[PDB]
From a paper:
Here we demonstrate temperature-dependent changes in the structure and function of [name], a temperature-sensitive Ca2+-activated ion channel.
To investigate the role of Cawarm in [name] channel function, we mutated a key residue in the binding site, Glu396, to alanine and performed electrophysiological studies. The crucial role of Glu396 in coordinating Cawarm led us to propose that these phenotypes stem from disrupted Ca2+ binding at this site. To test this idea, we determined the structure of [name]([name]) at 37 °C in the presence of saturating Ca2+, yielding exclusively the cold conformation.
Author numbering:
A (entry chain B): 782 to 835, 851 to 954
B (entry chain B): 1042 to 1090, 1115 to 1167
C (entry chain A): 7 to 25, 33 to 48, 59 to 174, 182 to 317, 328 to 386, 393 to 480, 500 to 514, 557 to 710, ...
D (entry chain B): 435 to 480, 500 to 514
The structure:
Amino acid sequence: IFMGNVVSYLLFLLLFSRVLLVDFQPAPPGSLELLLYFWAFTLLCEELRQGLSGSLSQRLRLYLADSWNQCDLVALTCFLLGVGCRLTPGLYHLGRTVLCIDFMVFTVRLLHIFTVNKQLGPKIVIVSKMMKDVFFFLFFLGVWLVAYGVATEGLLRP
Amino acid sequence: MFSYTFGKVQGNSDLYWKAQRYRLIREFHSRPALAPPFIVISHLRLLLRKEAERKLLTWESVHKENFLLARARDKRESDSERLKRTSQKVDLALKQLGHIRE
Amino acid sequence: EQSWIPKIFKKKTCTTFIVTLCQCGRPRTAHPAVATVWDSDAHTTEKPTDAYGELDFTGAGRKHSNFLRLSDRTDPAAVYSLVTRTWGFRAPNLVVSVLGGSGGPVLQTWLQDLLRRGLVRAAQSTGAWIVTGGLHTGIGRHVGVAVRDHQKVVAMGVAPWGVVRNRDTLINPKGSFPARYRWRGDPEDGVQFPLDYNYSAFFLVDDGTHGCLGGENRFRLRLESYISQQKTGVGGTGIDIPVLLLLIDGDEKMLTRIENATQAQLPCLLVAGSGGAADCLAETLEDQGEARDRIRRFFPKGDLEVLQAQVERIMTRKELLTVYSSEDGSEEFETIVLKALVKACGYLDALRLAVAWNRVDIAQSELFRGDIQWRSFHLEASLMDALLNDRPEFVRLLISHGLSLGHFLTPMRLAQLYSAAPSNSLIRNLLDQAPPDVGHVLRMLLGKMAPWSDLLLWALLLNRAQMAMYFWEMGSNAVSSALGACLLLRVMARLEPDAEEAARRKDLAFKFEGMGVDLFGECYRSSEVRAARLLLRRCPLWGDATCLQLAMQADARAFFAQDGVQSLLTQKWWGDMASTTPIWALVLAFFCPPLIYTRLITFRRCLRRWFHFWGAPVTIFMGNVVSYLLFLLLFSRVLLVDFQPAPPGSLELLLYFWAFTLLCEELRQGLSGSLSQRLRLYLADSWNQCDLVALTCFLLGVGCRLTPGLYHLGRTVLCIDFMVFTVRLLHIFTVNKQLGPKIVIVSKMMKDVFFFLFFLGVWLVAYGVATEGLLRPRDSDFPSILRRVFYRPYLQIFGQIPQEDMDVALMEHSNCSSEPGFWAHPPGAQAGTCVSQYANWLVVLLLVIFLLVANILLVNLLIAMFSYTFGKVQGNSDLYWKAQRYRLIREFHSRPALAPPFIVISHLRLLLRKEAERKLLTWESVHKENFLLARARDKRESDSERLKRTSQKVDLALKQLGHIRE
Amino acid sequence: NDRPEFVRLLISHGLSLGHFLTPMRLAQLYSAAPSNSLIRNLLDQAPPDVGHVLRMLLGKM
Ligand SMILES: [Ca+2]
Ligand SMILES: [Ca+2]
């Protein structure tokens, strides 16, 4: 079941890219785009099933507590928003941009695959724990960039 | 910093992964057998809708008794416990020696 | 399996009536329709038993105290079989049938101390059974409380059915596996008693009576006799189980029971000072007789001549009777039992019995006295018993007594020893598949590609750690035997159905490897010219395979790690040249052949030196390296310059011939180094796989080149083949003491590499597709799309950031496309004719995030993972390199002395075609003895052992102090 | 009185435990909760009535 799910998700990403790069046009959606809409709807139904069966509020919170479920939910929300914007006559470009970001959100989900390997799962956990060091570096670099950039801009006087 | 953190949280991360492995397996144990593109056909199906045990417990109890006996024997044969027993026996010998001296 | 229990066991009914009240203990009213002197057998009926199962005393207990109800006239063989097999009780090495009325609930302090310290302790030590009355009264209660205080011990209780309180709750014809018994019934009358809760199993003898005493005596005596007729395990090898009766106090009934037991040839132990019916016999044995009977025994029947006649009949067989000397409470039970059994005996030996028990001190005392004079078979039988029952200490002691072992072991005895394999054990299966016929199974395990040796092999096969250890200590070829034992144990472990059994074999193999390495270290540090140069390089009787071969097959990395073996391998690597020769000296000699004869290199005489220099593995390796470098140089020269569509030139033909010679060399390596077996062995090496793929690509490229139409394809294939060939040069660093471990660690870094690659691939796909979608370049060509989606983002990781092709601020605005919106014209060739500029700040933001993640976070994470892995697998990699060093040296030891370009001339040659040893073994044995003595002394002087000895000495002093105080 | 050794020894003497424990005895045992202890508070919030507090702690989900 896991392997079939992985293969289907890879095919879904392939179709999403195919639609986004080629078949996405201001005209009304084509056959492939409608297939993508149906596929995303089935993914939404699957997430709904996972949340619903897995004390309604209790199990809903239990489902929403998982990071991967949060990622799936945000991806699907962005997809719905992008489709809505695209269908509207005036918000075509905004919809395309939202879907472009949503593709990144969907693709990041593939990292879940490595949680099954005996060696990669611990690596992903450690990576998740590296974020304090990442933030320290980012804050230090931001301070340094502000200082240096403002000093140089003031000196040059463009 | 990355090197230090990676070296520091190796064991805890491994334990955490081993723990959540059960959650992963259980999640994929209950999912529909079909893929998301076709999973609609299965969500539709979901919609519209002893003596052996006693023997097992007895065997478990036998193993528990063996484990407890092993722990007790290991503790009793430890150096600290043997030293304590020797001290008590020496004290008993000393008391009997004082008693006989009278 | 219980339905058979009712089939073979029967209970008794009141049946016929004998007078108001039945003579069968039941009221005349409560009798069946069928109801002079009532008969326990004639006036009763037998029905299937309906009170079997096990007892679960409420709360405490082992949750299992097997019970049973059976007729008195029952054959004890069935009872013994049921107890031994069905209920799981092992065969008793000794049975103590405790007797004694012990009038009055209270018992003397010394008697209670003896029971809790002499009897119960001995029973637990020897795994004996204690047979008493399964009731909470009389001596049974005292025995039970002694057992409880000592606490397990097996206490069988044979009691009548009818005097047991709450007999109703036990009745369940279907079975009573969960049985609940309330031994604490409020009424307290002598008619019935409660079953004690300290006894492991009960036998409720049924004689068709509702209360009586002595009705079970017949069955008890019959069971005692039958047990005394059995054997002490190991099939018929064991001696007859000793069954003796212990008596404390008593009465005329006890005297009759003692008489019956003596008639049954059962030793009796009479406790001195126990009381009446026991001190009477003790005094009679020690030495008016009627006066003794009157004073000691109760006044009734004292003047009766029956008592005196019974005492006379008892003394008629006084050999069986023995008095437990008070000795101020000696509490030395095992020795007294042994003395009583010896006296009764007047074959059965104290040695065999001591071996049956695990008491080696008792046998040590028995043999230490010079009074006993032993013969050959006498000790041989005991040694066989010790071997069969896995008693290493006893075999050590027996061998220590000058027992000749060469004549002891015989094909019949060896067959018996192997026959003792435990039920369905791997050794048993292998023997069945294959007299012992051990050679066939040994060859099957290894593949086939002196009593001590045989006994060591047997112990290894049966996996008896201590016995195999001892046999190795007494063996001749210590180091080779240790390595062979490690090999055999590892092979068996890999071949075992159950992992837990395999782990024991694996641990034993590890222990043998440790002993082998320690002993060889001792031998080497004593004398290097011997030991390594001779012990390792000789071919023993194991498989006529040198110890190094055994270590290689066993994967005994620890054995290769030690400095002695490494120094020997280095010495073999340099051949006859001194191991200290500098590398530069070797190079100079290689390029200046005459300089070999100069004193600057240290070792017909001329031809001898010539062949010594050019045959050493190191010089062959250097020549091979030089030839391979020249081959790569020629390959590059051909590929870059002389490769043309025209027919091959001279240099290209030379390259073809050179590659052909390399192919022939690989063929030779695979062929000579069981055709399929050696082929797989060759193909298993990674370097051989690399060579094979390189040569296959070379053949494919040459074939394509020769074909008129596939010239370019051939050139491309050869271009890749050059990379494949060049990668082989990494094999050079496997010889350096520092680089080889590095290469091993590098090979182990691939998991981290793959993690990084997968992460980077996911990130690249996401970012590239997002950027391509945002820009909307109008090329929209599949190769161009793939380029912009994968290649360009990938190159951005290495500082190749084409801002002009992504940032609209750096491009020229133009109305390229008729589609609505604003567009810009990138200057890049493959950047798309024009890109949308709707939200370009988002493209720049994605570029910023991608640079951050990829360049910094992922790369630094990979560095951290590499650092961790490198630090973690240092030692294992070093050991692995030290182990494979032998394979490298052996491979280069057998190669032709000529280089691949000329190796054809040598492949052609290949085609068309003591007392010193005994002295060496003796010296090895001396060193082994020294090493074993050192280990034993170090263990004895350790703090833990000294503390244990002090505790024992303190206990001895305490016992002597208590003794003197009296 | 929290004397594990004594309870071990007493049980070791063939004391029948099934008949020993009774609802009154269990109520007494739970009544021995020390003054204001978490168990005491939970019992007050909820005879022992232990099942309810057990479900509350576990949640009975
Ligand atoms: Ca999910
Ligand atoms: Ca090769």
